[PDB]
Curated annotation (Swiss-Prot):
Subcellular localization(s) per the UniProt record: Secreted
Major place of residence: secreted
KW Hydrolase (keyword) present: yes
Gene Ontology MF term list: beta-N-acetylglucosaminidase activity; identical protein binding; lysozyme activity
Protein name: Lysozyme C
Keyword Secreted: yes
Amino acid sequence: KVFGRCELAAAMKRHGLDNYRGYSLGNWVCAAKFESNFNTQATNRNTDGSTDYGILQINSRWWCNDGRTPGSRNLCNIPCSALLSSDITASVNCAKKIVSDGNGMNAWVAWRNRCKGTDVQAWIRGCRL
Ligand SMILES: [Cl-]
Ligand SMILES: [Cl-]
Ligand SMILES: [Cl-]
Ligand SMILES: [Cl-]
Ligand SMILES: [Cl-]
Ligand SMILES: [Cl-]
Ligand code: NA
Ligand SMILES: [Xe]
Ligand SMILES: [Xe]
Ligand SMILES: [Xe]
C-alpha cells in the first residue's frame, strides 16, 4: 500500500509514534517519506547481503528474519515479510524498539541526512490530526 502523507501521519499517531522517545510525528513521516516514499512494500538490498523492508526500511541484519541474512539477529521477533503489510503495526512496533536502542532516529540514514534539523513539522501540516 502506498500511503498519502496525512494518512500515514494519522496512522502513526494512532500507533503511538507522536513524540515517542521524544520524536515528534513530523520526524516519522519525514523518515518514511525518504526511506520508502510511503510505500509499505519497498525493499532494498544492502551490500552486506542484508535487506531493508517496508515503510521505514527496517534491516534484516538486526531486526527481522528473512532467512537469507546469515548470522543476522531478529530483535523484533518478526518475519521481515510482516514489515511490508498495508497494516503498519509491525513496522511501528519494531521502529519503537529501534529508536530506543541507543542512537534514536539516527538509525535511519535518510532521517539523519534529510530530516534531522529541518522543519519536519511541515510533514504534518494540513492534516486532520
Ligand atoms: Cl509528499
Ligand atoms: Cl512534527
Ligand atoms: Cl520491493
Ligand atoms: Cl537469516
Ligand atoms: Cl495502518
Ligand atoms: Cl534520542
Ligand atoms: Na535477521
Ligand atoms: Xe530487493
Ligand atoms: Xe533501520
Ligand atoms: Xe511504521
